[PDB]
Homo-oligomer: A and B are copies of this chain.
């Protein structure tokens, strides 16, 4: 047969990419267009949904043009998969085919007041009142509370609700809508699981929660898997159907963190990914039975390949300041210049010789939520240097993950098998070594590090027959793309000390209000 290609629209918080993968899972064309960060009031953050749709359309047609200018075997795209910034919610009109306002973004805080009242009035004071249904606490992040807000603050949304023309959708839904020309109103299980309106046991909308949160079920889209036929591209927005040439099905849709889980081949229970970005998002595949957290971690859907196919659940945790902490050492403190120095300076001392740097600049998250904790350094001597503090910052990041994984292992009732990693801070080799040493497991670093875009492409290519099974997807990956594997190295003495010191230091972190 001939060369096969699968496309991935990667719609992030600050930009959109399109990446074309070949049948070997190589990224062979890519383009990136940013979209505007609108902030009307402090704490508020909005995206223009038409700009987002247009950006993806541009990325598609540029990346396609560049591919066919440099690859004479590239005939067409077999299917498109989509991955997205989760929780971000769009409100649009079923007849104008267009938004009634900008989209409040995942980390937007305008829903704070609604969050206090849902916990008080429906929760009886308990923000975990629906956690056995949603997998989620009452939080500003989740989609329903942004839907709620738009009805209470945007006349045109509240209007359109009345007339029976209102569509609420996460970015997966909105994109597949405008890509379709309005023919598809779908969402995948992983995105659906971030709304506070889905039931994890059924993977279906919860009539109760919709009712108690006063969100009409007609406004919501239909829940499907991550990998199956969602529709077709049928739009000439930036000559995207001209670029695609032939009729191209949308056969993949997955929320970004879940997409990184899937693109890192975390298919068996006990496999986990961490994205070392500005913050950290760790997801572990906990197997086919959902698992709930006694430590405030989120339960969510990992993935689901095929309509009503096996559905693997996951647990999810975050640290807020990973790459941010590295950046803070460079800009705010002058501890180094080019980002390659961070690791070189940290390597130049064999340990931290007593100091702990807890970088809780915007609170502690993980399994010890404490928004009063601030950034704090303890134990410094006249022998302490920037080298020591940099290494300690890296130790910190690895220690939080270790605490985060500890919670997951007890909640899930299983062990960590290995940790696949990506992001950017995963290029820091010494961090990766400290992380493996603390965890006692091998850390796998894929060299093709476009894993978030890849997850979406695998879903699409699976559904389209490009790859025929999860075991073939792993084989193609091992055969074609390299994986640097980082084994634990240190000692039980060093590890216990570091964790003991960590535990003490956390007791000194409280400071705010």
Please give the residue numbers on chain A whose beta carbons come within 8 Å of chain B beta carbons, in ascending order.
321, 324, 328, 332-336, 354, 361-362, 374-382, 384-386, 389, 504, 508-509, 511-512
A379 with B385: CB separation less than 8 A: no
A380 with B376: CB separation less than 8 A: yes
B380 with A361: CB separation less than 8 A: yes
Cβ contacts under 8 Å, A361 to chain B: 380-382, 384
Docked complex Cα distance between A511 and B356 (Å):
10
Cβ contacts under 8 Å, A382 to chain B: 321, 324, 328, 332, 361-362
A333 with B335: CB separation less than 8 A: yes
Docked complex Cα distance between A333 and B324 (Å):
19
Docked complex Cα distance between A453 and B375 (Å):
45
Partner of A389, one of B321, B333, B384, B385: B333
Partner of A385, one of B332, B378, B381: B332
Which 9 pairs, one residue from A and one from B, show the smallest C-beta to C-beta distance?
A375-B380, A508-B508, A332-B385, A379-B511, A377-B377, A374-B379, A361-B382, A361-B381, A333-B386
B375 with A381: CB separation less than 8 A: yes
**A184 to B: closest C-beta gap in Å:** 40
Cβ contacts under 8 Å, A374 to chain B: 354, 378-381
Q: Which residue of B lies closest to A331 (CB)?
A: B385
Docked complex Cα distance between A217 and B384 (Å):
45
**A325 to B: closest C-beta gap in Å:** 9
Docked complex Cα distance between A362 and B384 (Å):
11
**A502 to B: closest C-beta gap in Å:** 13
B380 with A379: CB separation less than 8 A: no
Cβ contacts under 8 Å, A381 to chain B: 361-362, 374-375
Task: Point out which of A378, A389, A508 has the most chain B C-beta atoms below 10 A from its C-beta.
Answer: A378
- 5 A–B contact pairs at CB < 8 A? A334-B386, A354-B374, A374-B378, A375-B381, A376-B376
Docked complex Cα distance between A5 and B362 (Å):
64
Cβ contacts under 8 Å, A375 to chain B: 377, 379-381, 384
Q: Which residue of B lies closest to A374 (CB)?
A: B379
**A322 to B: closest C-beta gap in Å:** 13
Cβ contacts under 8 Å, A321 to chain B: 382
Q: Which residue of B lies closest to A375 (CB)?
A: B380
Q: Which residue of B lies closest to A509 (CB)?
A: B378
**A326 to B: closest C-beta gap in Å:** 12
Task: Point out which of A379, A380, A384, A512 has the most chain B C-beta atoms below 10 A from its C-beta.
Answer: A380
**A496 to B: closest C-beta gap in Å:** 16
**A376 to B: closest C-beta gap in Å:** 5
Cβ contacts under 8 Å, A334 to chain B: 334-336, 386
**A455 to B: closest C-beta gap in Å:** 30
Cβ contacts under 8 Å, A504 to chain B: 511
**A384 to B: closest C-beta gap in Å:** 6
Cβ contacts under 8 Å, A508 to chain B: 376, 378, 508
Docked complex Cα distance between A511 and B508 (Å):
10
Q: Which residue of B lies closest to A363 (CB)?
A: B381
Q: Which residue of B lies closest to A359 (CB)?
A: B380
B385 with A333: CB separation less than 8 A: yes
**A382 to B: closest C-beta gap in Å:** 5
**A204 to B: closest C-beta gap in Å:** 40
Docked complex Cα distance between A335 and B331 (Å):
11
Q: Which residue of B lies closest to A508 (CB)?
A: B508
Docked complex Cα distance between A310 and B341 (Å):
63
Docked complex Cα distance between A385 and B508 (Å):
21
Task: Point out which of A333, A336, A389, A512 has the most chain B C-beta atoms below 10 A from its C-beta.
Answer: A333
Docked complex Cα distance between A354 and B511 (Å):
9
**A377 to B: closest C-beta gap in Å:** 5
